Each structure stands twice: as structure tokens, then as C-alpha cells.
Amino acid sequence: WTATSGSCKGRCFELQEVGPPDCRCDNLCKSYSSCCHDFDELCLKTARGWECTKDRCGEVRNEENACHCSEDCLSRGDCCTNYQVVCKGESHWVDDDCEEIKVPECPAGFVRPPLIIFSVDGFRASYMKKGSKVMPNIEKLRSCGTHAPYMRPVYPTKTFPNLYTLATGLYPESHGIVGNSMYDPVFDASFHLRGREKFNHRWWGGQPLWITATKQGVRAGTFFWSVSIPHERRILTILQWLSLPDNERPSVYAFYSEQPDFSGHKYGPFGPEMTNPLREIDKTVGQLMDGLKQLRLHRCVNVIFVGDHGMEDVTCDRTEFLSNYLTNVDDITLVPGTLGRIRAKSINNSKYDPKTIIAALTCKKPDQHFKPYMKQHLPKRLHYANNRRIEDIHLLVDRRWHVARKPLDVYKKCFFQGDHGFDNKVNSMQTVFVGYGPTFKYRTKVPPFENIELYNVMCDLLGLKPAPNNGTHGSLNHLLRTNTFRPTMPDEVSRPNYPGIMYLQSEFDLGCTCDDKVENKLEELNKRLHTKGSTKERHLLYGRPAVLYRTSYDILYHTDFESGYSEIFLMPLWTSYTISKQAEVSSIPEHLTNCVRPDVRVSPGFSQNCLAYKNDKQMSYGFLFPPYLSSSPEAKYDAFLVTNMVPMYPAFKRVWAYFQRVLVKKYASERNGVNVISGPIFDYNYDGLRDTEDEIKQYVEGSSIPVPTHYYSIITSCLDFTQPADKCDGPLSVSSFILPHRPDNDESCNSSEDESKWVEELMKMHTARVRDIEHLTGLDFYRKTSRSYSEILTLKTYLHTYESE
Ligand SMILES: *[C@@H]1O[C@H](CO)[C@@H](O[C@@H]2O[C@H](CO)[C@@H](O[C@@H]3O[C@H](CO[C@H]4O[C@H](CO)[C@@H](O)[C@H](O[C@H]5O[C@H](CO)[C@@H](O)[C@H](O)[C@@H]5O[C@H]5O[C@H](CO)[C@@H](O)[C@H](O)[C@@H]5O)[C@@H]4O)[C@@H](O)[C@H](O[C@H]4O[C@H](CO)[C@@H](O)[C@H](O)[C@@H]4O[C@H]4O[C@H](CO)[C@@H](O)[C@H](O)[C@@H]4O)[C@@H]3O)[C@H](O)[C@H]2NC(C)=O)[C@H](O)[C@H]1NC(C)=O
Ligand SMILES: O=C(Cn1cnc2ccc(N3CCN(C(=O)NC4CCCC4)CC3)cc2c1=O)NCc1ccc(Cl)c(Cl)c1
Ligand SMILES: [Ca+2]
Ligand SMILES: [Ca+2]
Ligand code: NA
Ligand code: NA
Ligand SMILES: [Zn+2]
């Protein structure tokens, strides 16, 4: 119940929301159907429209008007945004030449430059170039300020997950808004775009920027907007708030536009009908900047122009139906469209089985346009699993397609021509970022970055300490003129042991064999030097990784590679080696095919054993440093040490052996040498974080050898590829992956073919940031480089996407 017979007189767009049953006058009252009886009359004035005209200049103030053109309007803070242009001979902001904003030029009483976030729904990254002729205000923001060619949204590339990630710095699995539609089995409640459950605070986790600001004594304007409030009134409301007395005035404001998404769904991303919505958004930016200029704030405020996701061509005819694959389609609930999420229709149905549903959906049709996954098998870069609102079965839908349960769902719901939601590396899903103002740089282009990073920057712009989030604070310092955040590297928690030769061969009873009894003062001192680290400078280029948790491990040196060997997990945490452009690939010699050699530096008790692999009929092993890339026949023996062995399913060995035998050398050839760091990952609870020993769900049968859930590699070279990886003077270039360690290749529908036709495609799908590997391993890389720490943070957040231009 709302007692809507209270009044909005003197309350229009009040910032503090009043509680039930008292009637409301804030910017969300319409959404709750709770506005006072006189809200439209008093707060949504429209008389005489939104622009001054020559005849209105100097008029007698008429409080009925939408905005004012009387002499008093500037001191009232309620002029039409074009007042000074029409009535005082001033220019529009867009017509003024760009002039660098070296320092804030703010009115007296301003404690800090305000921040205005101007969020555009469905604004695809390529609109900034493709629509530039029809968006002159946005083009001035972009060209004069700091811009990225695009900004990467989070998955799924839907509105609410992305706007709430922008606000919190968190992945959707952590903030809890994992789709536009959700079921939470603990609450037993459903969240929808339509309706009221979405107003319940229990859905919305983390700490959004307006709460962060308020907790730290920075006032915030209200960020959500009721859809029916026209954009011109949203802009005039922000400008009125900016005219509040110092003690009342917010320091952070948000404008939201439902365009161009609304039209893009109807017309497709580049439908001829799209020009007009882009013109209208640009006119809104123009009103805001003219309005700021009238208030002498246009060289004081920092403005962020940012989108939530892009827009792809999608029509009804490109729909896959689950009824074409499943016999039992009425036993499932599907959340449909540009991603699929499946769960049982009834928790009482004991015959429901996810394994049989996955198998029925796997590679069934030659050009099948979705791929099913258990959520823990989704690419780790999506960070889309650790939330009970994410169903166990996920369908990754190809760009331009939908999935639905039955055909009747689609024609009893062609209308639409655009949609979004797909994998967030897809080019059509990318969106925009421009920062303009005293705190941003001038005429500066920055590389693409992820939207999870912007919360920290917004906190920096406002002098706030961010709540804990998934950004990497400091990685966007290159966007800023001032207010940079100067992080320190994390402290190493565990220091390594450096074991020497401590064990005799006969102390080992591992069931291993090697034909190495194959028999010099020149070359014996030489081999001893390699074991003490004489080549370590060639193979550990950026320092050893730091171990950020408590554990016991050993550094092991060799001619061709260095490793940090875990006595707890019985395998390396990391193995590092450099392959020059001139490196030669060789074979595993016949006499060494099944060779595994005890490592006399490491106790039998802290070693793997061959008998466990013989006994485990499902599990084989591979090596982290590949024997194919040994520098000499004699160095090759090091590659067969038991301390270089890791457990690998035979299906996975197909992938791994092709990466090591073919792709490493291909990269070294293309990039002028590469440094590779490879290792295992254990993430049995799919939280994106390193498992402790007591979280390991699978061991090599009969043993204490834990089975990795994934294997990573970080592949680094010189950004200037005229310099070899091992003699690089400047910035680095990286690409990385986190490959799922699976006992079959069902994910790859062409896996019966030669690995040259499917393995690199798999690897691209599982591309990763070095930061993703850091979370998953508790290691900290690139500790010893010539580069600034903020530059290294940017490098650790880089994702190689393998999308065309
Ligand atoms: C991305 O960045 C985020 C933010 O930094 C990272 O997430 C953090 O990760 C931490 C580890 O997973 C996690 O720390 C835990 O916090 C527990 C207290 O949690 C509450 O309070 C915080 C602080 O205000 C709050 O933010 C939390 O909010 C979550 O939960 C509510 C639901 O109630 C949601 O609305 C909200 O969206 C959010 O959900 C997300 O996180 C939870 C996990 O907390 C997931 O389950 C959800 O799926 C969703 O992803 C909470 O309200 C604290 O209890 C934990 O402590 C246990 O573990 C420690 C280990 O040190 C142990 O020592 C303790 O004893 C304790 O164990 C006991 O409980 C166990 C479980 O019941 C039990 O098994 C044991 O036997 C013990 O009794 C833990 O410290 C932190 O909360 C989240 N924060 C957020 C916002 O998500 C995220 O990791 C980053 N991602 C990547 C990839 O880097
Ligand atoms: O604006 C709209 C549409 N619209 C319209 N009317 C609404 C009325 C109320 C609510 N409620 C307020 C109480 N809630 C809330 O304050 N939650 C946070 C504060 C406490 C913890 C998290 C939960 C949400 C949401 C909306 C809403 O979305 N769309 C644009 C937009 C802008 C910014 C963001 Cl971040 C997002 Cl996700 C969406
Ligand atoms: Ca959207
Ligand atoms: Ca984990
Ligand atoms: Na075996
Ligand atoms: Na296959
Ligand atoms: Zn949309």
C-alpha cells in the first residue's frame, strides 16, 4: 500500500527515497507505482518543450515550463540547456575547439571534480567509427579525451549483468546478477526484467559504486532511472542536482539510455533505422555538455561514456530447437536465447540425468550452432560457474543464433533482427569507453580493456577506496592524468628450497625404467653448472614466479628449463623455458619412449611413481618441459625426470603433444623466440581460485598424485618482434591459455581428424589472461622486468582474443 495523497511540492527528484506507505518523488517512484499524486504535474513538466527560442529570451518566469529562458534561470539552475546559445550568443560545446584540460577548472565550493557516467545500452563498439558522421558531440568526447577502440563486456553479454559489473567491479558469478532472468533455488524465487522480485535487495551482491561513495562520505545521485522519464528530463535533473548547495550536491551521477539497444533489437545492429537513435543519443550528450558549459562545469567534471554490450544480427529462422535433439524435452526447463541454461523441470523427477542430456546435445548435427557444457567445463576466461543461480548445464550459442526448447516458443512468443548475450570475446558484443575531463588524459588512445576494471578507476576519480573486486587496480593507470593508484607487488609467502644431489638411484622404488646407463672433466663440470642454475638467465626471463601461499617447494635447475617443484602436489607448480627462433624440434628417441628417471635432488617420498600410471587404466602422463625441444641429445635426458612428469588423460595428451611438438616452435618462429611458463591448475570447486590440498577430488589410482583440472601456458615475447624474446629492451607481448584437462575430446567435434585441424581452435577458445592463471595458482609472475609495475599489470590483464579486426 502507498498513501499517494502526500505531495511532491519541493521534493521533485529528491535523492533520499522515503519509506512505505509514504509516497515517493525520487527518480524510481514510477517503477514502484508509488509516486505522489502530483508527481507528473510538478516533476514531469513538458510545457513549451526542451529548447529556448529567440522569442523566449528574457521571458517572465512561468513555473509551468519544462525549462526556463528567463534571466533568473542560471541562478535557479533550471535554464533550457541551449539558453546561453540562443539568448546570450554563446557557442554549443561541440563547436568549440578542443583545449587540453590540464587542471580541474571548478566553481568555488567544489571539493573534487564530479563524475558523470553516461551509460548507453547496446552501443556496439564499431558505432564509434561507423556512426561518427552523425554523432559530433560523442566524436568530440572521443577524439579529445581518452578512448579505447573497444571495451570487453562480461559474459553473458546481457544488460543487467553488465551494468551491475560496471557498478561493482565484479564478475556476474560473484555479484549474483548472472542473467536478465534467474532462478535462485535457495530463495526458491525467480528474477525477471519485468516485475517486482528484481527490486528485492537479496539478488544484488557486492558493493556498487553509489554505496561505496555513501559509506565514505561522498554523496551519490540516484543511478537507475524509471523508463518513462524522458531523457531530456534526466539531463535537466542532473544539471539541477549539480546546482545544489555544496553540502547537498552529489559528487557522482549516472545517466542511462535504453537506446540504441531498443532499436537494435528491432532493426539489427546496422539497420538503416539505426541512424536516428544514434543522432538522438548524440543530441542528448550535446544537451549535457551545453548544460555543463552554462554551469561553468565543462572543464571541471569527468565524463565517462560507456556501453554495456554490443548487438549482433539474429533472426527467428536462426534458432536451434532442443526438441530436435532430446526425447525428454518436457522434463527440462530452459533459459533460452543467445545462451542456454538447462535444469530439471521437477526436482521430484528422479529419472532426470545431466549426463544423458549433455550426450544427446553433443556434436549431433554437422553444423550444430550451439555447444553444451557442464558449467565447470566452460572456458575459465568466462568466470561463469561459481553461483547457485547458474544452472549446471550451459549451452554456448554461436554468434547470430538462438537456442529454444520447442518451435512453438518462437512463433508463439519474425519480429526481431538483433540480439546480444553471446561469448564476450565475440567482436559484435564489444562496446565503448570514452573518458573526458581533467583527470583523464588528452587525445589519448588506450588498448582495449575489460569492463570489470572500471569500478576501481571510478573509485580513483572520486578518491574512494574500492570494495574488494575483480579488477586489477593499477592496470588502467595509463588512462589517467592524475589520481593514479600505485600498487606494490604482493609479498612472497613461501621461499623455495634449492636442493642439491641428496639421493642415490637405488633409494628409488618407483617402478620406472630408463635406458640411460649410456656412459669427461670438460663436460662434467659443465653439467654441474647447469644443475646449479648457469642457464637460468636464458630460461627464467622475468624472475621466478612468487608463491603467495604457504607451501613446501623446490627450485630445480636444468640446461633447458627451470621449475618450481611442489613437494605437496608431487609435480611442478610452474616450469619455465625459452625457445629461440632458431630452435630445432627433435623426436623422442626410440630407446627413451617409456623412459622416466628418478631425480636425485628430490626424495622418493616426494616423487611420483610409474607403477601408479601402469595401474590406472584411464590415466597416462606427459611432461611439462617438452623433450621435443631439448637443446642436445644429452640435455634431452633431463626432460624425462620424474620431477617433470604430470598426469594426463590419453585424450588430453593428443592436445598437449601437438602444442609442444608443433605450436611452441611455430610461435617462436612467428614471434622471434618465446618464453613459456607451463603448469597444472586444480580448481575442483570451480571458483576460479587455487584449490588447497584437501579440495582435490581425483588422484591417480592408488596414489597421492593429484589430477589437475586444467593445464596452463603463458607465452611471452618482445612487443618489438625485431628483438629476440631473450634480449628484449622494451614492452612485452603475451598470450596464455588454460586448457581443460578432460578424458575425452567431446568438446571438439572434429577431433577424429589430424590435430592440425582442431587443436589450435580448442586452444583459442580457452585463451586466458595471466591474471586468470594467477588466481588459479596463487603464483605472481613478471616480478623482475625492466618495466613499470602498472605496465606489467596491464600486461597481466591482456587477453589474446583471436577475433579479426
Ligand atoms: C572476484 O572478487 C570477489 C570479491 O573479492 C571474490 O569473491 C570473494 O571471495 C572469497 C572466497 O571465495 C569470499 O570469502 C568468503 O567470505 C565469506 C563471507 O561472505 C559474506 O560476506 C561478504 C563480505 O561482505 C559478502 O561479499 C558475501 O557476498 C556473497 O554471498 C551473498 C550470498 O549470501 C551474495 O549476495 C553475494 O553475491 C556473494 O556471493 C558470491 O560469493 C559467495 C562466497 O562468499 C559464493 O558462494 C556465491 O556463489 C557468489 O559467488 C557474503 O555475504 C566467508 O564465510 C568465507 O569463509 C570461509 O572460508 C574460509 C577460507 O579462509 C574459512 O577460513 C572460513 O572458516 C569459512 O569457512 C566456513 O564456511 C564454509 C562454507 O559454509 C564451511 O565449509 C567451513 O567448514 C567453515 O565453516 C570466505 O572468506 C568472499 O565473500 C567473496 N566476495 C564476493 C563479493 O563474492 C572472488 O573470489 C573474485 N574472483 C576471482 C576469480 O578472483
Ligand atoms: O534503471 C534501469 C531499470 N530499472 C528501473 N527501475 C528500477 C527500480 C528499482 C530497482 N532496484 C532498486 C533497489 N536495488 C538496489 O538498490 N540494489 C543495490 C543497493 C543495495 C545493494 C545493491 C535493486 C534494484 C531497479 C530498477 C531498474 O533496474 N536500468 C538501467 C540500469 C542502471 C544501472 C544499473 Cl547498475 C543497472 Cl543493473 C540497470
Ligand atoms: Ca543492455
Ligand atoms: Ca578452487
Ligand atoms: Na595408465
Ligand atoms: Na570429439
Ligand atoms: Zn538488449
From Swiss-Prot:
Any single Pfam family the record assigns to this protein: Endonuclease_NS
Site location (Essential for catalytic activity): 796
Record: residues binding 1-tetradecanoyl-sn-glycerol 3-phosphate: 159, 180, 261, 420
Effect ascribed to mutating residue 380 to A: Impaired secretion. No effect on lysophospholipase activity
Primary enzyme class: hydrolase
Binding residues for 1-hexadecanoyl-sn-glycero-3-phosphate: 159, 180, 261, 420
Tissue: Abundantly expressed in cerebrum and cerebellum. Localized in secretory epithelial cells in the brain and the eye including choroid plexus epithelial cells, ciliary epithelial cells, iris pigment epithelial cells, and retinal pigment cells.
Record text on activity regulation: Inhibited by vanadate. Inhibited by micromolar levels of bile salts, such as tauroursodeoxycholate. Not inhibited by taurodeoxycholate. Not inhibited by hydroxysterols, such as 7-hydroxycholesterol, testosterone, dexamethasone and prednisolone. Inhibited by EDTA and EGTA.
Required for secretion: annotated segments: 773-794
EC number: 3.1.4.39, 3.1.4.4
Compartment annotation: Secreted
Enzyme active site: 159
Region (Nuclease-like domain): 541-805
Cystine bridges: 8-25, 12-43, 23-36, 29-35, 52-69, 57-87, 67-80, 73-79, 98-144, 106-300, 316-414, 363-749, 512-610, 514-595, 718-728
GO terms, molecular function: alkylglycerophosphoethanolamine phosphodiesterase activity; calcium ion binding; lysophospholipase activity; nucleic acid binding; phosphodiesterase I activity; phospholipase D activity; polysaccharide binding; scavenger receptor activity
Membrane-crossing residue ranges in chain numbering: none
Motif residue range(s): Cell attachment site: 76-78
Effect on the protein upon substituting residue 261 to N: Abolishes lysophospholipase D activity
GO cellular component terms, semicolon-separated: extracellular space; membrane
PANTHER family xrefs: ECTONUCLEOTIDE PYROPHOSPHATASE/PHOSPHODIESTERASE, ECTONUCLEOTIDE PYROPHOSPHATASE_PHOSPHODIESTERASE FAMILY MEMBER 2
Name used for this protein in its record: Autotaxin
Organism, scientific name: Rattus norvegicus
